[PDB]
Design a protein around this ligand. Structure first.
Ligand SMILES: O=C(O)[C@H]1[C@H]2CC[C@H](CC2)[C@@H]1Nc1nc(-c2c[nH]c3ncc(F)cc23)ncc1F
Ligand SMILES: [Br-]
Ligand SMILES: [Br-]
Length: 162
Protein backbone atom coordinates (compact mmCIF):
# COMPACT_ATOMS: atom_id res chain seq x y z
CA UNK A 1 0.00 0.00 0.00
CA UNK A 2 1.17 3.66 -0.49
CA UNK A 3 -0.83 6.94 -0.16
CA UNK A 4 -0.68 9.62 -2.89
CA UNK A 5 -3.03 12.63 -3.12
CA UNK A 6 -5.01 11.21 -0.18
CA UNK A 7 -5.76 7.95 -2.07
CA UNK A 8 -4.51 4.54 -0.88
CA UNK A 9 -2.90 2.91 -3.95
CA UNK A 10 -2.50 -0.91 -4.18
CA UNK A 11 -0.89 -2.60 -7.18
CA UNK A 12 -3.31 -5.38 -8.24
CA UNK A 13 -1.30 -6.63 -11.27
CA UNK A 14 1.84 -6.18 -13.34
CA UNK A 15 5.31 -4.91 -12.54
CA UNK A 16 7.59 -1.98 -13.28
CA UNK A 17 11.19 -0.92 -13.07
CA UNK A 18 12.33 2.62 -12.27
CA UNK A 19 14.40 4.70 -14.77
CA UNK A 20 15.58 8.13 -13.42
CA UNK A 21 14.78 10.66 -16.19
CA UNK A 22 15.04 14.47 -16.52
CA UNK A 23 11.80 15.89 -17.94
CA UNK A 24 11.04 19.46 -18.99
CA UNK A 25 7.85 21.04 -17.61
CA UNK A 26 5.48 23.33 -19.52
CA UNK A 27 7.20 26.35 -17.85
CA UNK A 28 10.67 25.01 -18.81
CA UNK A 29 11.77 23.73 -15.35
CA UNK A 30 13.66 20.40 -15.13
CA UNK A 31 12.46 17.63 -12.78
CA UNK A 32 14.35 14.41 -12.08
CA UNK A 33 11.56 11.79 -11.86
CA UNK A 34 11.62 8.03 -11.19
CA UNK A 35 9.74 6.90 -14.32
CA UNK A 36 8.01 3.51 -13.82
CA UNK A 37 8.42 1.27 -16.92
CA UNK A 38 5.96 -1.59 -17.51
CA UNK A 39 2.22 -2.48 -17.46
CA UNK A 40 0.47 -2.12 -14.08
CA UNK A 41 -2.99 -1.87 -12.56
CA UNK A 42 -3.77 -0.14 -9.26
CA UNK A 43 -6.78 0.46 -7.09
CA UNK A 44 -7.16 3.95 -5.58
CA UNK A 45 -9.26 4.22 -2.42
CA UNK A 46 -10.30 7.62 -1.05
CA UNK A 47 -12.89 8.84 1.46
CA UNK A 48 -15.10 10.26 -1.35
CA UNK A 49 -13.90 8.49 -4.55
CA UNK A 50 -12.59 5.10 -5.65
CA UNK A 51 -10.84 4.22 -8.89
CA UNK A 52 -9.22 1.46 -10.92
CA UNK A 53 -6.18 2.68 -12.81
CA UNK A 54 -4.57 0.70 -15.64
CA UNK A 55 -1.36 2.21 -16.99
CA UNK A 56 1.82 1.58 -18.93
CA UNK A 57 5.05 3.56 -19.15
CA UNK A 58 4.09 7.27 -18.92
CA UNK A 59 0.61 6.35 -20.26
CA UNK A 60 -2.86 6.20 -18.67
CA UNK A 61 -4.67 3.27 -20.38
CA UNK A 62 -7.92 3.27 -18.37
CA UNK A 63 -9.26 5.02 -15.26
CA UNK A 64 -12.67 3.90 -13.97
CA UNK A 65 -13.82 6.21 -11.13
CA UNK A 66 -16.83 6.41 -8.81
CA UNK A 67 -17.36 9.23 -6.32
CA UNK A 68 -19.58 11.30 -4.03
CA UNK A 69 -19.80 14.33 -6.38
CA UNK A 70 -18.09 16.01 -9.41
CA UNK A 71 -15.43 17.67 -7.13
CA UNK A 72 -14.51 14.28 -5.50
CA UNK A 73 -14.30 12.60 -8.95
CA UNK A 74 -12.16 15.49 -10.30
CA UNK A 75 -9.83 15.09 -7.25
CA UNK A 76 -9.30 11.38 -8.16
CA UNK A 77 -8.78 12.22 -11.86
CA UNK A 78 -6.04 14.87 -11.05
CA UNK A 79 -4.14 12.32 -8.93
CA UNK A 80 -4.40 9.62 -11.58
CA UNK A 81 -3.25 12.04 -14.36
CA UNK A 82 -0.17 12.97 -12.27
CA UNK A 83 0.50 9.33 -11.29
CA UNK A 84 0.37 8.40 -15.02
CA UNK A 85 3.60 10.51 -15.55
CA UNK A 86 2.17 11.39 -19.02
CA UNK A 87 4.08 14.01 -21.07
CA UNK A 88 0.85 16.05 -21.56
CA UNK A 89 0.62 16.35 -17.71
CA UNK A 90 4.34 17.43 -17.49
CA UNK A 91 3.77 19.96 -20.33
CA UNK A 92 0.63 21.35 -18.59
CA UNK A 93 2.68 22.99 -15.75
CA UNK A 94 2.29 26.81 -15.96
CA UNK A 95 3.18 29.92 -14.02
CA UNK A 96 5.76 30.75 -11.31
CA UNK A 97 8.99 28.70 -11.43
CA UNK A 98 8.29 27.26 -7.99
CA UNK A 99 9.99 23.84 -8.48
CA UNK A 100 13.25 25.88 -9.02
CA UNK A 101 12.43 28.23 -6.06
CA UNK A 102 12.92 25.17 -3.86
CA UNK A 103 16.57 23.98 -4.01
CA UNK A 104 17.92 22.28 -0.81
CA UNK A 105 14.36 21.36 0.39
CA UNK A 106 14.90 18.36 -1.99
CA UNK A 107 11.13 17.74 -2.31
CA UNK A 108 9.54 14.73 -4.07
CA UNK A 109 8.92 15.85 -7.73
CA UNK A 110 5.73 13.79 -8.13
CA UNK A 111 4.36 15.47 -4.95
CA UNK A 112 5.42 18.86 -6.40
CA UNK A 113 3.50 18.09 -9.61
CA UNK A 114 0.37 16.98 -7.75
CA UNK A 115 0.49 20.05 -5.48
CA UNK A 116 0.82 22.26 -8.61
CA UNK A 117 -2.30 20.81 -10.28
CA UNK A 118 -4.30 20.87 -6.95
CA UNK A 119 -3.95 24.72 -7.23
CA UNK A 120 -5.75 24.80 -10.64
CA UNK A 121 -6.35 21.77 -12.94
CA UNK A 122 -7.98 23.66 -15.85
CA UNK A 123 -4.88 23.56 -18.14
CA UNK A 124 -4.19 19.90 -17.17
CA UNK A 125 -7.75 18.93 -18.20
CA UNK A 126 -7.78 21.10 -21.36
CA UNK A 127 -4.49 19.51 -22.58
CA UNK A 128 -5.13 15.87 -21.64
CA UNK A 129 -7.34 15.08 -24.65
CA UNK A 130 -10.86 13.77 -25.27
CA UNK A 131 -12.08 10.77 -27.23
CA UNK A 132 -15.36 9.25 -28.39
CA UNK A 133 -16.56 6.42 -26.09
CA UNK A 134 -18.43 3.13 -26.45
CA UNK A 135 -21.93 3.07 -24.93
CA UNK A 136 -21.21 0.83 -21.84
CA UNK A 137 -24.27 0.56 -19.52
CA UNK A 138 -23.58 2.13 -16.09
CA UNK A 139 -20.56 4.11 -17.40
CA UNK A 140 -20.44 7.74 -18.61
CA UNK A 141 -17.86 10.17 -20.00
CA UNK A 142 -16.57 13.19 -18.14
CA UNK A 143 -15.48 16.26 -20.17
CA UNK A 144 -12.66 18.65 -19.29
CA UNK A 145 -15.29 21.04 -17.68
CA UNK A 146 -16.21 18.01 -15.39
CA UNK A 147 -19.70 17.76 -16.98
CA UNK A 148 -20.98 14.30 -18.03
CA UNK A 149 -21.16 13.10 -21.65
CA UNK A 150 -22.59 9.83 -23.08
CA UNK A 151 -20.57 10.37 -26.28
CA UNK A 152 -17.12 11.79 -25.39
CA UNK A 153 -14.76 11.75 -22.40
CA UNK A 154 -11.31 12.69 -21.18
CA UNK A 155 -8.97 10.19 -22.81
CA UNK A 156 -8.97 6.80 -20.99
CA UNK A 157 -11.37 8.06 -18.25
CA UNK A 158 -14.88 6.77 -17.46
CA UNK A 159 -17.18 7.37 -14.47
CA UNK A 160 -19.17 4.46 -13.04
CA UNK A 161 -22.56 6.22 -12.35
CA UNK A 162 -23.65 6.46 -8.64
O1 LIG B 1 8.51 8.99 -4.70
C1 LIG B 1 7.87 8.02 -5.31
O2 LIG B 1 8.38 7.47 -6.26
C2 LIG B 1 6.54 7.71 -4.75
C3 LIG B 1 5.74 9.02 -4.75
C4 LIG B 1 5.35 9.42 -6.19
C5 LIG B 1 4.44 8.37 -6.78
C6 LIG B 1 4.33 7.19 -5.79
C7 LIG B 1 3.73 7.59 -4.44
C8 LIG B 1 4.49 8.81 -3.93
C9 LIG B 1 5.75 6.66 -5.56
N1 LIG B 1 5.72 5.43 -4.80
C10 LIG B 1 5.50 4.23 -5.41
N2 LIG B 1 5.26 4.18 -6.72
C11 LIG B 1 5.08 3.03 -7.35
C12 LIG B 1 4.71 3.04 -8.70
C13 LIG B 1 4.51 1.91 -9.49
N3 LIG B 1 4.19 2.30 -10.77
C14 LIG B 1 4.16 3.61 -10.79
N4 LIG B 1 3.90 4.34 -11.87
C15 LIG B 1 3.95 5.67 -11.72
C16 LIG B 1 4.29 6.26 -10.50
F1 LIG B 1 4.30 7.60 -10.40
C17 LIG B 1 4.57 5.50 -9.37
C18 LIG B 1 4.51 4.14 -9.54
N5 LIG B 1 5.15 1.83 -6.75
C19 LIG B 1 5.45 1.87 -5.40
C20 LIG B 1 5.65 3.06 -4.74
F2 LIG B 1 5.93 3.15 -3.43
BR1 LIG C 1 9.89 10.86 -8.32
BR1 LIG D 1 -15.92 16.99 -29.67
Amino acid sequence: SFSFGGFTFKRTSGSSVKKEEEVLTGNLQTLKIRVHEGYEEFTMVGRRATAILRKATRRLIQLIVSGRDEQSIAEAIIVAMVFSQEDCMIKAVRGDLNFVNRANQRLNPMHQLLRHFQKDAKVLFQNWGIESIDNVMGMIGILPDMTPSTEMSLRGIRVSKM
